[PDB]
């Protein structure tokens, strides 16, 4: 199974920058050996939402409208690592972020589906 471990979340202020990293190890259960990645956030009193996603190759990414501009999702050169660069935090952003691996290819990556493995969660609080 794909072991996902995140870190980098914590205390900041509105207009700052913060960077979350998601390490990945182990083989997967489905597919031919690959997997796409994505980030989700849990906000108190609201349902879980899909915030960013990247195809296994990096040919295309997807962002939720309210983060486009400000957030970017990438993967470094040797890879198991996924990053989420958060710039110009607004306070609404305030929540617990999660990274998840998708073992089987999907036609539309804006879709919340196929995420078999989940990381543990990092609280991000934006004070004013
Ligand atoms: Cu390969
Ligand atoms: Cu593939």
Residue 110: domain span: 1-128
Domain count, the chain: 1
Ramachandran assignment for 15, one of left (phi > 0), alpha (psi -120 to 50 degrees), beta (any other): left
Phi, psi of 104 (to 5 degrees): -120, 135
Cα–Cα distances (Å) from 62 to 15, 25, 52, 74, 82, in that order, read 22, 23, 5, 11, 14
Place of tokens 């031919």: 32
CA of 48 to the centre of ligand 2 (A): 26
Count Cβ atoms within 10 A of the Cβ of residue 30 and give its class: 0-12 exposed, 13-18 middle, 19 or more buried.
Answer: exposed
Note the ligand closest to the C-alpha atom of 31. 2
The widest CA-to-CA distance across the chain, in whole angstroms, is 46
Q: Which CATH number do you get for residue 30?
A: 2.60.40.10
Ligand nearest to the CA of 34: 2
Query: Could you tell me the two tokens for 43?
Result: 């906000």
Name the token pair of 121: 């969660």
CA distances from 42 to 26, 29, 79, 104, 124 (A): 26, 26, 26, 24, 10
The dihedral formed by the CA atoms of 69, 123, 47 and 17, expressed in degrees to the nearest 10? -10
How far away, in angstroms, is 54 Cα from ligand 2 center?
12
Ligand 1 centroid to residue 57 C-alpha, Å: 10
Ordered DSSP codes for 1-60: --EEEEE---EEETT-EEEEEEEEES--SSTTS--EEEEEEE-TTS--EEEEEE-TTSS-
Task: Determine the distance separating the centroid of ligand 2 and the alpha carbon of 45, expressed in angstroms.
Answer: 36
Backbone phi and psi for residue 78, each to the nearest 5 degrees, phi listed first: -65, 135
Tokens describing residue 117: 């493995």
Ligand 2 mean position, distance from CA 59 (Å): 12
């Amino acid at each position: 199974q794909v072991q996902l471990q995140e870190s980098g979340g914590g205390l900041v202020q509105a207009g700052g920058s913060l960077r979350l990293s998601c390490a990945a190890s182990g083989r997967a259960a489905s597919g031919h050996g690959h997997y796409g990645m994505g980030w989700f956030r849990q906000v108190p009193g609201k349902e879980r939402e899909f915030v960013a996603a990247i195809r296994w190759s990096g040919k295309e990414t997807w962002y939720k409208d309210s983060v486009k501009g400000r957030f970017t999702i990438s993967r470094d050169n040797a890879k198991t690592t996924v990053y989420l660069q958060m710039n110009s935090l607004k306070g609404e952003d305030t929540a617990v972020y999660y990274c998840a691996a998708r073992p089987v290819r999907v036609a539309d990556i804006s879709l919340p589906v196929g995420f078999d493995y989940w990381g543990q969660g990092t609280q991000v609080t934006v004070s004013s």
